[PDB]
mmCIF file of C-alpha atoms and ligand atoms in Angstrom:
data_model
loop_
_atom_site.group_PDB
_atom_site.id
_atom_site.type_symbol
_atom_site.label_atom_id
_atom_site.label_comp_id
_atom_site.label_asym_id
_atom_site.label_seq_id
_atom_site.Cartn_x
_atom_site.Cartn_y
_atom_site.Cartn_z
ATOM 1 C CA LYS D 281 193.521 153.192 -8.709
ATOM 2 C CA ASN D 282 195.426 150.211 -10.217
ATOM 3 C CA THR D 283 193.702 147.243 -11.965
ATOM 4 C CA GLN D 284 194.681 143.713 -10.913
ATOM 5 C CA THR D 285 193.302 140.302 -11.829
ATOM 6 C CA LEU D 286 191.681 140.233 -8.284
ATOM 7 C CA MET D 287 190.600 143.462 -6.606
ATOM 8 C CA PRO D 288 189.856 143.423 -2.808
ATOM 9 C CA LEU D 289 186.497 144.858 -1.726
ATOM 10 C CA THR D 290 187.330 145.602 1.903
ATOM 11 C CA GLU D 291 184.615 148.053 3.104
ATOM 12 C CA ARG D 292 182.284 146.450 5.730
ATOM 13 C CA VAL D 293 178.974 147.717 7.129
ATOM 14 C CA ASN D 294 177.136 146.735 10.360
ATOM 15 C CA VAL D 295 173.724 146.837 8.657
ATOM 16 C CA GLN D 296 171.719 146.666 11.900
ATOM 17 C CA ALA D 297 173.478 149.581 13.614
ATOM 18 C CA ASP D 298 174.824 151.752 10.782
ATOM 19 C CA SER D 299 173.779 153.214 7.411
ATOM 20 C CA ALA D 300 176.124 152.270 4.503
ATOM 21 C CA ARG D 301 178.218 155.196 3.100
ATOM 22 C CA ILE D 302 178.034 155.581 -0.726
ATOM 23 C CA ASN D 303 181.667 154.331 -1.000
ATOM 24 C CA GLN D 304 180.862 151.041 0.876
ATOM 25 C CA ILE D 305 178.145 149.978 -1.502
ATOM 26 C CA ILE D 306 179.121 147.324 -4.027
ATOM 27 C CA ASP D 307 177.828 147.240 -7.596
ATOM 28 C CA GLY D 308 174.985 149.556 -6.583
ATOM 29 C CA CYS D 309 173.232 146.816 -4.541
ATOM 30 C CA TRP D 310 175.350 145.063 -1.867
ATOM 31 C CA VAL D 311 177.251 145.790 1.246
ATOM 32 C CA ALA D 312 179.794 143.419 2.754
ATOM 33 C CA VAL D 313 179.736 142.025 6.230
ATOM 34 C CA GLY D 314 182.343 139.985 8.230
ATOM 35 C CA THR D 315 186.155 140.007 8.289
ATOM 36 C CA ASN D 316 187.810 142.847 6.358
ATOM 37 C CA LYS D 317 191.050 141.070 5.289
ATOM 38 C CA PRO D 318 191.846 141.956 1.645
ATOM 39 C CA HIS D 319 191.643 138.359 0.577
ATOM 40 C CA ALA D 320 188.213 137.707 2.085
ATOM 41 C CA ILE D 321 186.271 139.173 -0.807
ATOM 42 C CA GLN D 322 187.554 140.223 -4.223
ATOM 43 C CA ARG D 323 186.164 141.183 -7.528
ATOM 44 C CA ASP D 324 187.451 138.419 -9.818
ATOM 45 C CA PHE D 325 188.264 139.431 -13.399
ATOM 46 C CA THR D 326 189.670 135.906 -14.043
ATOM 47 C CA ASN D 327 186.558 133.864 -13.640
ATOM 48 C CA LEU D 328 183.659 135.407 -15.459
ATOM 49 C CA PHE D 329 180.013 134.729 -15.017
ATOM 50 C CA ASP D 330 177.680 135.988 -17.830
ATOM 51 C CA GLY D 331 180.806 137.762 -19.297
ATOM 52 C CA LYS D 332 181.253 139.894 -16.079
ATOM 53 C CA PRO D 333 183.639 139.490 -13.190
ATOM 54 C CA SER D 334 182.425 137.389 -10.255
ATOM 55 C CA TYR D 335 183.012 137.682 -6.586
ATOM 56 C CA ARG D 336 185.743 135.426 -5.064
ATOM 57 C CA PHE D 337 185.256 134.760 -1.365
ATOM 58 C CA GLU D 338 187.925 133.127 0.834
ATOM 59 C CA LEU D 339 188.364 132.395 4.482
ATOM 60 C CA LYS D 340 191.708 130.956 5.633
ATOM 61 C CA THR D 341 192.146 128.763 8.687
ATOM 62 C CA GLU D 342 192.668 131.731 10.995
ATOM 63 C CA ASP D 343 189.697 133.842 9.795
ATOM 64 C CA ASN D 344 187.167 132.849 12.393
ATOM 65 C CA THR D 345 186.447 136.187 14.050
ATOM 66 C CA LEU D 346 183.110 135.415 15.638
ATOM 67 C CA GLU D 347 181.680 133.572 18.681
ATOM 68 C CA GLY D 348 179.341 130.566 18.359
ATOM 69 C CA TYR D 349 176.494 129.515 20.730
ATOM 70 C CA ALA D 350 178.465 126.690 22.435
ATOM 71 C CA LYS D 351 181.296 127.626 24.807
ATOM 72 C CA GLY D 352 184.676 128.210 23.077
ATOM 73 C CA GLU D 353 182.870 127.884 19.720
ATOM 74 C CA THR D 354 183.976 130.100 16.850
ATOM 75 C CA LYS D 355 182.572 131.059 13.424
ATOM 76 C CA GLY D 356 183.941 132.968 10.358
ATOM 77 C CA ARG D 357 182.028 135.279 8.037
ATOM 78 C CA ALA D 358 182.606 137.158 4.726
ATOM 79 C CA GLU D 359 179.280 137.769 3.005
ATOM 80 C CA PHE D 360 177.326 140.244 0.914
ATOM 81 C CA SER D 361 173.958 141.520 2.284
ATOM 82 C CA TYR D 362 171.249 142.673 -0.219
ATOM 83 C CA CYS D 363 169.583 144.562 2.740
ATOM 84 C CA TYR D 364 170.965 147.779 4.209
ATOM 85 C CA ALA D 365 169.956 151.478 4.651
ATOM 86 C CA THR D 366 171.963 154.502 3.388
ATOM 87 C CA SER D 367 172.044 158.081 4.595
ATOM 88 C CA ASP D 368 169.374 158.853 1.945
ATOM 89 C CA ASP D 369 166.849 156.707 3.790
ATOM 90 C CA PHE D 370 167.094 159.137 6.738
ATOM 91 C CA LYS D 371 167.519 162.476 4.914
ATOM 92 C CA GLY D 372 164.932 165.050 5.963
ATOM 93 C CA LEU D 373 163.769 163.089 9.050
ATOM 94 C CA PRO D 374 164.294 164.251 12.614
ATOM 95 C CA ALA D 375 167.865 163.545 13.805
ATOM 96 C CA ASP D 376 166.772 161.177 16.528
ATOM 97 C CA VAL D 377 165.259 158.668 14.055
ATOM 98 C CA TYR D 378 168.653 157.450 12.901
ATOM 99 C CA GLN D 379 170.203 157.798 16.441
ATOM 100 C CA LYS D 380 167.473 155.599 17.966
ATOM 101 C CA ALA D 381 167.716 153.191 15.035
ATOM 102 C CA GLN D 382 171.378 152.580 15.716
ATOM 103 C CA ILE D 383 170.541 151.949 19.358
ATOM 104 C CA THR D 384 167.744 149.465 18.699
ATOM 105 C CA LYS D 385 169.666 147.822 15.803
ATOM 106 C CA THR D 386 166.927 148.661 13.383
ATOM 107 C CA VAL D 387 168.854 150.894 10.838
ATOM 108 C CA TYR D 388 168.285 148.280 8.081
ATOM 109 C CA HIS D 389 164.473 148.350 8.612
ATOM 110 C CA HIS D 390 164.669 151.797 6.949
ATOM 111 C CA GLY D 391 166.397 150.541 3.736
ATOM 112 C CA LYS D 392 165.883 148.325 0.737
ATOM 113 C CA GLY D 393 166.274 144.613 0.140
ATOM 114 C CA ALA D 394 163.944 142.840 2.605
ATOM 115 C CA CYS D 395 160.745 141.079 1.524
ATOM 116 C CA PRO D 396 157.611 141.170 3.716
ATOM 117 C CA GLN D 397 156.242 138.487 5.979
ATOM 118 C CA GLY D 398 154.194 135.836 4.267
ATOM 119 C CA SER D 399 155.126 137.044 0.750
ATOM 120 C CA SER D 400 155.970 135.150 -2.468
ATOM 121 C CA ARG D 401 159.414 135.751 -4.021
ATOM 122 C CA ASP D 402 161.732 134.454 -6.764
ATOM 123 C CA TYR D 403 165.505 134.492 -6.275
ATOM 124 C CA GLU D 404 168.338 133.440 -8.601
ATOM 125 C CA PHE D 405 172.046 133.341 -7.979
ATOM 126 C CA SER D 406 175.043 131.440 -9.242
ATOM 127 C CA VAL D 407 177.964 129.673 -7.652
ATOM 128 C CA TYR D 408 181.289 128.170 -8.797
ATOM 129 C CA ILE D 409 182.862 125.502 -6.613
ATOM 130 C CA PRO D 410 186.461 124.816 -7.715
ATOM 131 C CA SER D 411 188.123 121.400 -7.425
ATOM 132 C CA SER D 412 190.350 122.845 -4.799
ATOM 133 C CA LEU D 413 187.573 123.085 -2.179
ATOM 134 C CA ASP D 414 187.918 120.318 0.466
ATOM 135 C CA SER D 415 184.990 117.947 0.917
ATOM 136 C CA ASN D 416 184.975 118.552 4.712
ATOM 137 C CA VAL D 417 184.180 122.266 4.613
ATOM 138 C CA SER D 418 181.361 123.400 6.823
ATOM 139 C CA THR D 419 180.089 126.586 5.269
ATOM 140 C CA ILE D 420 176.834 128.227 4.200
ATOM 141 C CA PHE D 421 177.116 129.931 0.759
ATOM 142 C CA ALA D 422 173.699 131.569 0.381
ATOM 143 C CA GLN D 423 171.093 132.222 3.144
ATOM 144 C CA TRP D 424 167.881 134.100 3.690
ATOM 145 C CA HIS D 425 168.045 135.664 7.064
ATOM 146 C CA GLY D 426 165.250 136.855 9.367
ATOM 147 C CA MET D 427 164.830 140.277 10.942
ATOM 148 C CA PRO D 428 164.053 139.933 14.690
ATOM 149 C CA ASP D 429 161.625 142.227 16.513
ATOM 150 C CA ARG D 430 164.205 144.465 18.171
ATOM 151 C CA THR D 431 161.955 145.986 20.836
ATOM 152 C CA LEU D 432 160.102 142.750 21.634
ATOM 153 C CA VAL D 433 161.053 141.862 25.181
ATOM 154 C CA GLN D 434 160.392 139.527 28.074
ATOM 155 C CA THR D 435 160.297 141.346 31.403
ATOM 156 C CA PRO D 436 161.782 140.110 34.649
ATOM 157 C CA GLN D 437 158.243 138.845 35.415
ATOM 158 C CA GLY D 438 158.159 136.398 32.481
ATOM 159 C CA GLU D 439 155.797 138.551 30.449
ATOM 160 C CA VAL D 440 156.360 139.302 26.731
ATOM 161 C CA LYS D 441 155.933 142.980 25.822
ATOM 162 C CA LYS D 442 156.452 144.969 22.590
ATOM 163 C CA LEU D 443 158.146 148.184 23.673
ATOM 164 C CA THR D 444 158.124 151.359 21.574
ATOM 165 C CA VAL D 445 161.535 152.413 20.247
ATOM 166 C CA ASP D 446 161.663 155.123 22.921
ATOM 167 C CA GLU D 447 160.854 152.682 25.722
ATOM 168 C CA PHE D 448 163.535 150.301 24.448
ATOM 169 C CA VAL D 449 166.112 153.113 24.293
ATOM 170 C CA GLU D 450 165.242 153.852 27.913
ATOM 171 C CA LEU D 451 165.651 150.197 28.871
ATOM 172 C CA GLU D 452 169.117 150.150 27.295
ATOM 173 C CA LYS D 453 170.205 152.866 29.692
ATOM 174 C CA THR D 454 169.997 150.378 32.540
ATOM 175 C CA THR D 455 170.371 146.999 30.734
ATOM 176 C CA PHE D 456 173.490 145.484 29.157
ATOM 177 C CA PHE D 457 172.332 142.979 26.543
ATOM 178 C CA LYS D 458 174.646 140.044 25.962
ATOM 179 C CA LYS D 459 173.231 139.105 22.558
ATOM 180 C CA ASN D 460 169.682 138.205 23.709
ATOM 181 C CA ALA D 461 170.013 138.224 27.508
ATOM 182 C CA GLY D 462 169.724 141.337 29.798
ATOM 183 C CA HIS D 463 172.420 141.955 32.445
ATOM 184 C CA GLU D 464 172.899 144.545 35.198
ATOM 185 C CA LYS D 465 174.743 147.347 33.482
ATOM 186 C CA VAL D 466 177.885 147.658 35.639
ATOM 187 C CA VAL D 467 180.158 150.631 35.147
ATOM 188 C CA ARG D 468 183.488 149.212 34.241
ATOM 189 C CA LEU D 469 186.367 150.281 36.455
ATOM 190 C CA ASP D 470 189.852 150.773 34.992
ATOM 191 C CA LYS D 471 192.774 149.564 37.064
ATOM 192 C CA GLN D 472 192.997 153.103 38.502
ATOM 193 C CA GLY D 473 189.571 152.837 40.167
ATOM 194 C CA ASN D 474 187.993 155.209 37.619
ATOM 195 C CA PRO D 475 185.114 154.755 35.148
ATOM 196 C CA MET D 476 186.748 153.507 31.938
ATOM 197 C CA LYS D 477 186.092 155.441 28.721
ATOM 198 C CA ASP D 478 185.745 154.170 25.151
ATOM 199 C CA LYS D 479 188.561 154.913 22.727
ATOM 200 C CA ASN D 480 186.599 157.949 21.487
ATOM 201 C CA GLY D 481 185.139 159.096 24.831
ATOM 202 C CA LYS D 482 182.028 156.923 25.284
ATOM 203 C CA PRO D 483 181.696 155.374 28.829
ATOM 204 C CA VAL D 484 182.115 151.632 29.129
ATOM 205 C CA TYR D 485 180.108 149.010 30.898
ATOM 206 C CA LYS D 486 180.102 145.275 31.351
ATOM 207 C CA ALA D 487 177.456 142.780 32.292
ATOM 208 C CA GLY D 488 176.748 141.968 35.912
ATOM 209 C CA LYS D 489 174.225 139.215 36.575
ATOM 210 C CA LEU D 490 171.216 138.433 34.429
ATOM 211 C CA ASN D 491 168.671 141.074 35.340
ATOM 212 C CA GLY D 492 165.613 139.254 34.081
ATOM 213 C CA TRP D 493 165.150 141.029 30.724
ATOM 214 C CA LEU D 494 165.319 139.186 27.417
ATOM 215 C CA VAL D 495 165.184 140.606 23.855
ATOM 216 C CA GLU D 496 164.649 138.706 20.542
ATOM 217 C CA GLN D 497 168.083 138.298 18.802
ATOM 218 C CA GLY D 498 169.717 135.795 16.370
ATOM 219 C CA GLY D 499 168.100 132.473 15.486
ATOM 220 C CA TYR D 500 168.732 130.067 12.680
ATOM 221 C CA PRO D 501 168.447 131.316 9.083
ATOM 222 C CA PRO D 502 165.106 130.444 7.594
ATOM 223 C CA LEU D 503 166.780 129.090 4.443
ATOM 224 C CA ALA D 504 170.409 128.130 3.881
ATOM 225 C CA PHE D 505 172.392 126.465 1.071
ATOM 226 C CA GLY D 506 175.658 124.967 2.325
ATOM 227 C CA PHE D 507 178.084 122.103 2.606
ATOM 228 C CA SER D 508 178.577 120.082 5.768
ATOM 229 C CA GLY D 509 179.797 116.648 6.644
ATOM 230 C CA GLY D 510 180.466 115.785 3.010
ATOM 231 C CA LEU D 511 177.024 116.867 1.749
ATOM 232 C CA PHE D 512 175.627 119.816 -0.165
ATOM 233 C CA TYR D 513 172.318 120.572 1.557
ATOM 234 C CA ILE D 514 169.324 122.968 1.432
ATOM 235 C CA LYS D 515 167.884 123.466 4.951
ATOM 236 C CA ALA D 516 164.670 125.404 5.776
ATOM 237 C CA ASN D 517 163.885 126.461 9.331
ATOM 238 C CA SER D 518 160.585 127.693 10.910
ATOM 239 C CA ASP D 519 160.092 129.394 14.284
ATOM 240 C CA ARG D 520 156.441 130.250 15.192
ATOM 241 C CA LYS D 521 157.147 131.541 18.713
ATOM 242 C CA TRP D 522 156.348 135.268 19.020
ATOM 243 C CA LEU D 523 159.412 135.830 21.121
ATOM 244 C CA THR D 524 162.125 133.388 19.903
ATOM 245 C CA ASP D 525 163.575 131.006 22.482
ATOM 246 C CA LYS D 526 167.253 131.025 21.808
ATOM 247 C CA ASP D 527 167.840 127.869 23.864
ATOM 248 C CA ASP D 528 165.468 125.801 21.798
ATOM 249 C CA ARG D 529 167.920 124.144 19.507
ATOM 250 C CA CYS D 530 166.081 122.599 16.631
ATOM 251 C CA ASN D 531 168.681 122.319 13.783
ATOM 252 C CA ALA D 532 168.575 119.236 11.532
ATOM 253 C CA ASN D 533 171.899 117.466 10.818
ATOM 254 C CA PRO D 534 171.912 116.880 7.044
ATOM 255 C CA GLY D 535 173.853 113.573 7.259
ATOM 256 C CA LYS D 536 171.457 112.052 9.861
ATOM 257 C CA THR D 537 168.160 113.510 8.702
ATOM 258 C CA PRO D 538 166.111 112.302 5.854
ATOM 259 C CA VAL D 539 164.844 114.814 3.240
ATOM 260 C CA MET D 540 161.439 116.429 3.895
ATOM 261 C CA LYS D 541 161.048 114.912 7.397
ATOM 262 C CA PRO D 542 161.184 117.879 9.684
ATOM 263 C CA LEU D 543 163.059 117.783 12.951
ATOM 264 C CA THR D 544 160.580 119.556 15.418
ATOM 265 C CA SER D 545 160.413 121.198 18.864
ATOM 266 C CA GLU D 546 157.271 122.812 20.424
ATOM 267 C CA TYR D 547 157.696 125.951 18.200
ATOM 268 C CA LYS D 548 160.436 125.167 15.640
ATOM 269 C CA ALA D 549 160.918 122.896 12.604
ATOM 270 C CA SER D 550 164.172 122.322 10.687
ATOM 271 C CA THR D 551 163.768 120.567 7.413
ATOM 272 C CA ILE D 552 166.400 119.205 4.944
ATOM 273 C CA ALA D 553 164.748 120.000 1.599
ATOM 274 C CA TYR D 554 167.593 118.412 -0.408
ATOM 275 C CA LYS D 555 170.987 116.852 0.040
ATOM 276 C CA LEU D 556 173.778 115.488 -2.216
ATOM 277 C CA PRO D 557 177.164 113.943 -1.604
ATOM 278 C CA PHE D 558 179.875 116.557 -2.033
ATOM 279 C CA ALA D 559 181.653 114.446 -4.732
ATOM 280 C CA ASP D 560 178.619 114.606 -6.914
ATOM 281 C CA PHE D 561 178.152 118.385 -6.788
ATOM 282 C CA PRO D 562 179.535 119.783 -10.183
ATOM 283 C CA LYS D 563 183.059 121.409 -9.677
ATOM 284 C CA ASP D 564 184.785 124.116 -11.810
ATOM 285 C CA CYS D 565 181.631 125.326 -13.485
ATOM 286 C CA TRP D 566 178.925 127.919 -12.852
ATOM 287 C CA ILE D 567 175.824 126.569 -11.298
ATOM 288 C CA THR D 568 172.641 128.695 -11.316
ATOM 289 C CA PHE D 569 169.934 128.127 -8.681
ATOM 290 C CA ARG D 570 166.394 129.386 -9.185
ATOM 291 C CA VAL D 571 164.555 129.520 -5.859
ATOM 292 C CA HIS D 572 160.803 130.261 -5.387
ATOM 293 C CA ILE D 573 159.731 130.827 -1.767
ATOM 294 C CA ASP D 574 156.158 131.259 -0.378
ATOM 295 C CA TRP D 575 157.109 132.303 3.096
ATOM 296 C CA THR D 576 155.089 130.697 5.902
ATOM 297 C CA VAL D 577 152.345 132.947 7.366
ATOM 298 C CA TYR D 578 152.346 133.045 11.132
ATOM 299 C CA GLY D 579 149.700 134.424 13.603
ATOM 300 C CA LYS D 580 151.875 136.793 15.633
ATOM 301 C CA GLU D 581 150.863 136.774 19.325
ATOM 302 C CA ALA D 582 148.690 133.739 18.625
ATOM 303 C CA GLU D 583 151.922 131.877 17.615
ATOM 304 C CA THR D 584 150.059 129.855 14.992
ATOM 305 C CA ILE D 585 150.975 128.651 11.520
ATOM 306 C CA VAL D 586 148.261 130.481 9.557
ATOM 307 C CA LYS D 587 149.474 129.090 6.215
ATOM 308 C CA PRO D 588 152.483 126.681 5.586
ATOM 309 C CA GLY D 589 155.136 127.889 3.086
ATOM 310 C CA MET D 590 156.459 126.323 -0.086
ATOM 311 C CA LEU D 591 159.950 125.932 -1.539
ATOM 312 C CA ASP D 592 160.946 125.192 -5.146
ATOM 313 C CA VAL D 593 164.487 124.968 -6.448
ATOM 314 C CA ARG D 594 166.003 124.264 -9.840
ATOM 315 C CA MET D 595 169.718 123.736 -10.323
ATOM 316 C CA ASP D 596 171.142 124.484 -13.819
ATOM 317 C CA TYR D 597 174.633 124.003 -15.201
ATOM 318 C CA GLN D 598 176.642 122.760 -18.216
ATOM 319 C CA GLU D 599 177.935 119.246 -18.298
ATOM 320 C CA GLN D 600 180.078 117.872 -21.046
ATOM 321 C CA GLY D 601 178.706 120.169 -23.669
ATOM 322 C CA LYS D 602 175.065 120.598 -22.761
ATOM 323 C CA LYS D 603 172.516 122.278 -20.477
ATOM 324 C CA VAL D 604 171.262 120.337 -17.487
ATOM 325 C CA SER D 605 168.404 121.514 -15.255
ATOM 326 C CA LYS D 606 167.672 119.513 -12.165
ATOM 327 C CA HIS D 607 164.427 120.105 -10.224
ATOM 328 C CA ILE D 608 166.059 119.370 -6.905
ATOM 329 C CA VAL D 609 163.263 120.752 -4.653
ATOM 330 C CA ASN D 610 159.970 120.265 -6.384
ATOM 331 C CA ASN D 611 157.179 122.536 -5.128
ATOM 332 C CA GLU D 612 157.470 121.323 -1.553
ATOM 333 C CA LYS D 613 155.085 122.328 1.160
ATOM 334 C CA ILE D 614 157.290 123.264 4.076
ATOM 335 C CA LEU D 615 157.550 125.424 7.147
ATOM 336 C CA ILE D 616 159.944 128.304 6.434
ATOM 337 C CA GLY D 617 160.247 131.639 8.106
ATOM 338 C CA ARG D 618 159.992 133.268 11.484
ATOM 339 C CA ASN D 619 156.975 134.741 13.388
ATOM 340 C CA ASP D 620 158.171 138.383 13.344
ATOM 341 C CA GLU D 621 156.814 141.719 12.135
ATOM 342 C CA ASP D 622 159.491 142.130 9.450
ATOM 343 C CA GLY D 623 160.459 139.592 6.635
ATOM 344 C CA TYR D 624 163.740 138.304 5.254
ATOM 345 C CA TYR D 625 166.773 139.316 3.223
ATOM 346 C CA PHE D 626 169.338 137.496 1.139
ATOM 347 C CA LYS D 627 173.067 137.072 1.756
ATOM 348 C CA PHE D 628 175.756 135.130 -0.028
ATOM 349 C CA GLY D 629 179.431 134.396 0.548
ATOM 350 C CA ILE D 630 181.067 132.272 3.306
ATOM 351 C CA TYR D 631 179.472 131.678 6.646
ATOM 352 C CA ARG D 632 181.703 129.142 8.300
ATOM 353 C CA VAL D 633 179.717 127.203 10.913
ATOM 354 C CA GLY D 634 179.904 124.140 13.213
ATOM 355 C CA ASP D 635 183.122 125.411 14.721
ATOM 356 C CA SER D 636 185.146 124.654 11.594
ATOM 357 C CA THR D 637 188.416 126.176 10.510
ATOM 358 C CA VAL D 638 188.903 124.206 7.203
ATOM 359 C CA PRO D 639 189.622 126.875 4.420
ATOM 360 C CA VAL D 640 186.913 127.816 2.132
ATOM 361 C CA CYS D 641 187.178 129.529 -1.251
ATOM 362 C CA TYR D 642 184.652 129.672 -4.054
ATOM 363 C CA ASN D 643 182.966 132.255 -6.294
ATOM 364 C CA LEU D 644 179.427 133.659 -6.407
ATOM 365 C CA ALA D 645 177.663 135.935 -8.962
ATOM 366 C CA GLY D 646 174.477 136.801 -10.784
ATOM 367 C CA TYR D 647 171.982 137.589 -8.018
ATOM 368 C CA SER D 648 168.489 138.830 -8.830
ATOM 369 C CA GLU D 649 165.196 138.822 -7.005
ATOM 370 C CA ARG D 650 161.658 139.496 -8.233
ATOM 371 C CA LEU D 651 158.248 139.944 -6.554
ATOM 372 C CA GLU D 652 156.225 137.209 -8.154
HETATM 373 CA CA1 LIG T 225 159.424 137.266 16.746
#
């Protein structure tokens, strides 16, 4: 209720486990995820894109709030997600639909903003990298993220089963899932000898030993635009395993990997579709990317590539007076996607990876997305 040159957008939504309230939605189409510090995300009336304010994202050195895969690893996040559900997506349904969705982390499957498996889509967004950004940042600024099968499990007998939502809710009563791995659900004892309770009543557990159950969770993003090691890069990832193997690292290093030569494992491929030295990426101007994706088609339980995907990217900006359009990924056949039931959704902002704490600050704007 007081206009400034930068206005913090501090509401955050857990899109897997919670519907977005009307007052958390941004510009009618986004919700924010990651650290809620006022400076992390602001509407920027000082740097306009298409004559409208843009979104200024910033993580400072201390803003890593998240844990990485490797021990003692951290990561930092302030992003917008184009995919979330609202209370209107559940209105009129039985009350247990939303309750069980929060439990299985499937609330967002009931909302807008995801494209289907194996579909064709066009995306466009714009970014502004100021001169002030350090050439050693390690950050992803736009990504298309997958949607894991939340009730797909491996039993303690090594068999892969797709549970119903109800069956999974039952499993969760006796299994404490540490990200993707099931653990004995041990009642946690307070120092008094008594069962500890949540802040707001709920009973609290902790993981005992691995109990044999696994669930699909996480995984690399199928497409990511970022900077790392002094390079701008576009990286596409493919996972054709029905149940993702979280331990199968297959993640191409941009600086060591040539373009369009996939790094592969039995089931995964990570491909650098494009890279450019940081010094050569245009600074202090708005750059517009137009991305066409034909998502790879996978064979589900057969774990096959039914049809490879395709990626095309144009990069447009003004230089010294005129329009420049560079066809930086030219209609490339590529493996891109994940073998899941559900498809993919877009996010932009700062996703600080590779255990980096170098500050990051840049602006993003102008997203649209069309079924074509
Ligand atoms: Ca899967």
